[PDB]
Design a protein around this ligand. Structure first.
Ligand SMILES: CCCCCC(=O)SCCNC(=O)CCNC(=O)[C@H](O)C(C)(C)COP(=O)(O)OP(=O)(O)OC[C@H]1O[C@@H](n2cnc3c(N)ncnc32)[C@H](O)[C@@H]1OP(=O)(O)O
Lengths: 129, 129, 127, 130
């Protein structure tokens, strides 16, 4: 089920061309994943209490049009796949005119932050999604 | 042919998990492509002179193992495909023990800096690579 | 008075390997708050673009009293405490959810032509 | 006893105004302090494992002139005070033509990172910087 997250573009996100730096979008996507989990009570507390961390294993981003300084964006996020130890997030960013700026597909793996090796998906997360 | 670029990991690149933040690698890869171009005399000055800029159209990043604070990394970069308006860079990151940490494939489009619309690769770029 | 409040959530991108917010991240947080304060007083950046005005930091002093951490919801507090000629001073501080004072800053900002120009009369009148 | 460190300005460091973002200089200064420690044989990743870390307690930065894309900068760094738990770094940034761009003064405090509580500077670090 879709989760929406608003993001304002600030000077820090821009680059010399007047557009958002392409790596800043990657950070925006991470914020939206974090907020989606937070919304489902999967805070860092609840995660690291039942043995977890989440790390990015593979990420594909396709860039169509730029965001500019002071734009108000919407990050849209869905969990489209769940396996043994991993989830796939399907994400995209639109601007206030609903113009599609870029899209991402993010494979995420559940690990142990001390040693960082694949841990099975907690059943709480599987049932929640 | 392979272009090698060293990158040191600083606090600004790390996050609270104690490893490099996944978006930081995207910036590392960009620096290596910039320095690869610079090695062939395609500086920012030479590119502006021939009315050319490069933008990332699509990027896939594979995260195998973490970099940490104080690691001296080597980014390895090769141009593996050259189309009419487009270049594909294949890149990878190893640490000082030559452990493969990370790999990327980057589709880069040639645009004019005025309209940001695609344009044919400069003949010098085609001839050089 | 001019006191403006702005919330900021701490994300992974803001943290560093020590487990706390990287010290340069606070500098960005303070800039967002100045930007939003100006938006609240009807000086969005596209409006400022139309009046030929930009703002650049000339000098800043930051005091780091206690750290912010991943997932903290912070409040940036911002006041314009002086204005004269071409420049103005922002006084800013950051508190966490317990109202612990984490940080404070004094920022000298100069109005420029996107070179130093006098403050707009509307900006001075507003503050 | 100055320590010099070069830094190339990349597209990631620029902002919409065409110049380096004012917070990027702050990161440049941190890199130079880290490299000064590294030149004197100290690794902050290794020190972390010994429950030793350094945090910024106070910083002043003055911006005189901008850096731009592809500039090769030199960060210049000295330790000007050292006592108890703390060090003062005095730093500046010049460009390739030796134009003074930026200056900073940074009060740094040694802490146990587990508790984020100050501690005496390591004896070997004191020995190293006089
Ligand atoms: C390590 C990874 C990061 C790498 C480098 C970075 O980016 S560094 C990240 C940015 N820097 C920081 O986060 C440092 C934050 N500062 C601190 O944690 C602490 O100030 C610190 C141990 C240096 C110093 O603590 P001290 O109390 O011994 O020093 P000092 O007396 O000067 O502190 C001034 C005021 O701050 C208060 N104070 C100190 N620690 C506090 C805390 N944890 N929670 C609430 N208040 C605190 C003091 O009691 C005092 O309050 P009163 O004046 O009201 O009596």
């Amino acid at each position: 089920t879709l989760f929406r997250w608003p993001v304002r573009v600030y000077y820090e996100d821009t680059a010399a061309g007047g557009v958002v730096y392409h790596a800043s979008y990657v950070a925006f996507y991470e914020r939206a994943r974090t907020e989606m989990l937070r919304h489902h009570h999967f805070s860092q507390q609840a995660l690291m209490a039942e043995r977890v961390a989440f790390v990015v294993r593979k990420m594909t981003v396709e860039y169509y049009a730029p965001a500019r300084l002071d734009d108000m964006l919407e990050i849209q996020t869905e969990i489209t796949s769940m396996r043994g130890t991993s989830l796939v997030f399907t994400q995209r960013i639109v601007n206030a005119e609903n113009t599609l700026l870029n899209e991402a597909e993010v494979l995420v793996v559940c690990v142990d932050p001390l040693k960082m090796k694949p841990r099975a998906l907690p059943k709480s997360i599987v049932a929640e999604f």
